[PDB]
Amino acid sequence: MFERFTDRARRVVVLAQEEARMLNHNYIGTEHILLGLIHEGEGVAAKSLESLGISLEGVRSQVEEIIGQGQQAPSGHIPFTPRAKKVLELSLREALQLGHNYIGTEHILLGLIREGEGVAAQVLVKLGAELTRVRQQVIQLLSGY
């Protein structure tokens, strides 16, 4: 399932799980993948989001306002929302189309933007980062060579 992921992209998912757990969330949603992307820091996704002033604390706070903390931290494995799974499926399609054999942070963010209709998307907009501008930042950073 994560065989195609880069090392950094694996950390994104692992950190997404813990972001969900910290909020006593019962699923890893798109917003937790967003947090995992920021958390990684060195990837194209984090750089793109940082350039648009999208911060870890900004996102966590929005998530808390929109979703709110759950009552019980889950133990062990937290499943993906259907939407988050769709984002990861789309992440593969992004990587394939761009001619990569691996899924990197860039592809996860492009996948997330492409889905464009869950909590992550809601958060981004609330924070002033329109989805097209997020995608543009990612493409620009991938186009500088």
Side-chain angles (χ1 to χ4, degrees), residues 16-59:
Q17 182 161 241
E18 299 310 312
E19 293 290 325
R21 196 188 313 286
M22 272 187 293
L23 289 163
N24 300 356
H25 291 169
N26 286 316
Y27 301 85
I28 313 172
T30 61
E31 72 280 28
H32 307 108
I33 290 173
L34 178 60
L35 285 166
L37 294 166
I38 297 166
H39 207 143
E40 185 278 307
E42 292 314 305
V44 168
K47 299 301 180 50
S48 298
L49 293 162
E50 177 185 47
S51 72
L52 306 181
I54 303 296
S55 64
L56 194 66
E57 288 303 350
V59 170

Side-chain angles (χ1 to χ4, degrees), residues 1 3 12 16 26 29 31 36 38 45 66 73 76 81 96-97 119 122 139:
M1 162 172 210
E3 186 171 4
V12 163
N26 286 316
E31 72 280 28
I38 297 166
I66 296 173
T81 61
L96 291 175
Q97 285 180 91
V119 188
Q122 202 196 150
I139 293 298

Side-chain angles (χ1 to χ4, degrees), residues 105-121:
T105 75
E106 47 274 33
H107 302 117
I108 298 169
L109 183 48
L110 287 173
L112 183 152
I113 295 301
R114 196 164 300 284
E115 196 288 331
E117 290 188 9
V119 188

Side-chain angles (χ1 to χ4, degrees), residues 57-140:
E57 288 303 350
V59 170
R60 286 176 176 163
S61 292
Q62 284 305 308
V63 171
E64 281 184 301
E65 298 181 7
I66 296 173
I67 306 305
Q69 267 216 64
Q71 305 272 292
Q72 186 64 264
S75 85
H77 161 280
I78 307 176
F80 288 116
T81 61
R83 192 176 315 259
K85 288 182 299 180
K86 180 77 180 171
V87 163
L88 299 180
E89 290 165 357
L90 287 171
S91 303
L92 170 65
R93 288 195 65 64
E94 289 288 309
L96 291 175
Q97 285 180 91
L98 267 52
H100 305 124
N101 51 348
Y102 55 79
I103 298 177
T105 75
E106 47 274 33
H107 302 117
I108 298 169
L109 183 48
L110 287 173
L112 183 152
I113 295 301
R114 196 164 300 284
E115 196 288 331
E117 290 188 9
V119 188
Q122 202 196 150
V123 167
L124 282 170
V125 176
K126 304 304 176 62
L127 284 181
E130 294 308 310
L131 297 188
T132 55
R133 204 177 74 247
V134 180
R135 178 184 222 289
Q136 285 179 17
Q137 196 72 9
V138 170
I139 293 298
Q140 158 201 119

